[PDB]
Amino acid sequence: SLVELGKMILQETGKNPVTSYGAYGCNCGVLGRGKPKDATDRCCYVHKCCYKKLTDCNPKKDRYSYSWKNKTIVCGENNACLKELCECDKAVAICLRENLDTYNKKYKNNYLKPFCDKALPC
Amino acid sequence: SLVELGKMILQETGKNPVTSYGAYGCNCGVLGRGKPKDATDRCCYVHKCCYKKLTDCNPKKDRYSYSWKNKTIVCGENNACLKELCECDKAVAICLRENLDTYNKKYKNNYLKPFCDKALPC
Amino acid sequence: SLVELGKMILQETGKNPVTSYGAYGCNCGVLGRGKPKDATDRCCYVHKCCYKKLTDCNPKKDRYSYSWKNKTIVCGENNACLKELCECDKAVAICLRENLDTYNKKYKNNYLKPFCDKALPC
Amino acid sequence: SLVELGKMILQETGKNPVTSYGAYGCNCGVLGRGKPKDATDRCCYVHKCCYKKLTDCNPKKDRYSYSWKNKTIVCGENNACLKELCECDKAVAICLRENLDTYNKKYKNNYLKPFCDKALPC
Ligand SMILES: CCc1c(C(=O)C(N)=O)c2c(OCC(=O)O)cccc2n1Cc1ccccc1
Ligand SMILES: CCc1c(C(=O)C(N)=O)c2c(OCC(=O)O)cccc2n1Cc1ccccc1
Ligand SMILES: CCc1c(C(=O)C(N)=O)c2c(OCC(=O)O)cccc2n1Cc1ccccc1
Numbered sequence A, B, C, D: 001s002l003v004e005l006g007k008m009i010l011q012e013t014g015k016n017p018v019t020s021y022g023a024y025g026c027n028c029g030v031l032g033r034g035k036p037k038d039a040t041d042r043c044c045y046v047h048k049c050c051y052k053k054l055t056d057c058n059p060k061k062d063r064y065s066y067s068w069k070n071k072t073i074v075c076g077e078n079n080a081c082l083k084e085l086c087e088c089d090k091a092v093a094i095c096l097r098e099n100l101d102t103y104n105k106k107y108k109n110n111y112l113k114p115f116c117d118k119a120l121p122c
């Protein structure tokens, strides 16, 4: 769920998911995909494509278990959908950390929302 | 201060410092040094010796700054006491994480109140 | 920003950046690039080309942190743009020092403005 | 003179000579030699011994010339006493930089006369 996702983002990046990624670019924290504005935005674009493959479980509200071992996210062996859901959130946490260097303050808090292009298919 | 120390332990080990290390063995959390019970206890033994050589500041109360970059603790530059105080806290966070493999709840002071021998000098 | 740049130039060259480089040649301190009149001028040409690559921050007005360690300018860790900015400024301060030998006061005070040719592209 | 000495210290160490070294340990910035408290203090003890040999001039008062060339203090030529005086000052500026790693503001007198033993002779 968003509980697990937010904890992974903070564990990997050290940032509050809401204040830093609540509405960044055309994809991060908002509903629906748009053409990404930068690399951080593209992380959330891929993550939304990860989610849409997952029927038989609810990515937004379904809880799951994971552990933080050797400063690494380790998805607990689980249901197929829950395991894949955990691997979706782990990928976007790593992706957001990796692109902190080009994180741009001008893209937060839905400054880009009126300018967002229609997204290409996943 | 204990504020920064607590966040480093959380970021490195993934554990709550109060529940996991608030009173563990003969050195972790408790006041004063004793002969260590295991590898985790020895981390806190070393950390307490690290604090002992700091005289120009109050290790428990004085605040400093540090960064979480690439899942690594990076101490902020400061005067001798505050910088070395940050380094004391960093080494114990890494040490406790490295020794999670042998962390044993039997050394938590709430499971069994350990009999602690007089510590050797630092 | 110019505050950090001016301190670097003083630290490296020992010269006041305003009085020595406020309007030197066809590139130093003045607006716009021109064909360099000497090696000092070319330092500022390269520096202006360095700035032109930076589009995610404001090279003239954005602050950054650096320190003086072992008589070396050491750029503090930041985002990609601010780190590249600091490295642009460190490089021009260093370049200006290396070419103090051929510094010509005849090129000061924007005397060469009618002599400035179109520069080669960056 | 002290004017040239203070400029050297700022150039080499990056520190304000008054606020960092104006009364530090048993030798730095105070009158007379004492048993050094640490490596920084020892730099000032050695420097005071350097001044002791300069009888043909006035170390604190007499001016001399030096240049900041390639981030090196270069004493200008002069008579024996004044050239030796500049080299005394250059040496203490270098010594203080080299020992910034163990600088500790705990040794600043802060207008309380510390316990100072009689120094070894020189
Ligand atoms: C970038 C972080 C993010 C999402 C992403 O990781 C992302 N934009 O992909 C996301 C999200 O995405 C899933 C989806 O769109 O269904 C939906 C809703 C909020 C979303 N926050 C913000 C957040 C998450 C967890 C705790 C606190 C804040
Ligand atoms: C192992 C964690 C620890 C200490 C150590 O790291 C350790 N035992 O060395 C320590 C401590 O030690 C310093 C000293 O003895 O002055 C004193 C008091 C509490 C101490 N907690 C618990 C804690 C720290 C920070 C936030 C919340 C809880
Ligand atoms: C050569 C020094 C210099 C610039 C350069 O280093 C240079 N010509 O590249 C520069 C400058 O250049 C950046 C740009 O044109 O955007 C713009 C404005 C002033 C500029 N001073 C003068 C100065 C710098 C810092 C403090 C005080 C005076």
Ligand SMILES: CCc1c(C(=O)C(N)=O)c2c(OCC(=O)O)cccc2n1Cc1ccccc1
Residues within 6 Å of the ligand: D002, D003, D005, D006, D007, D009, D017, D018, D021, D022, D027, D028, D029, D030, D031, D032, D043, D044, D045, D047, D048, D051, D059, D060, D092
């Ligand atoms: C450590 C710096 C220092 C002295 C030394 O370098 C040192 N303690 O040797 C020293 C000093 O020493 C020479 C002597 O006692 O005759 C005498 C007086 C002040 C002295 N400041 C402080 C200072 C010097 C220059 C400008 C501003 C502040």
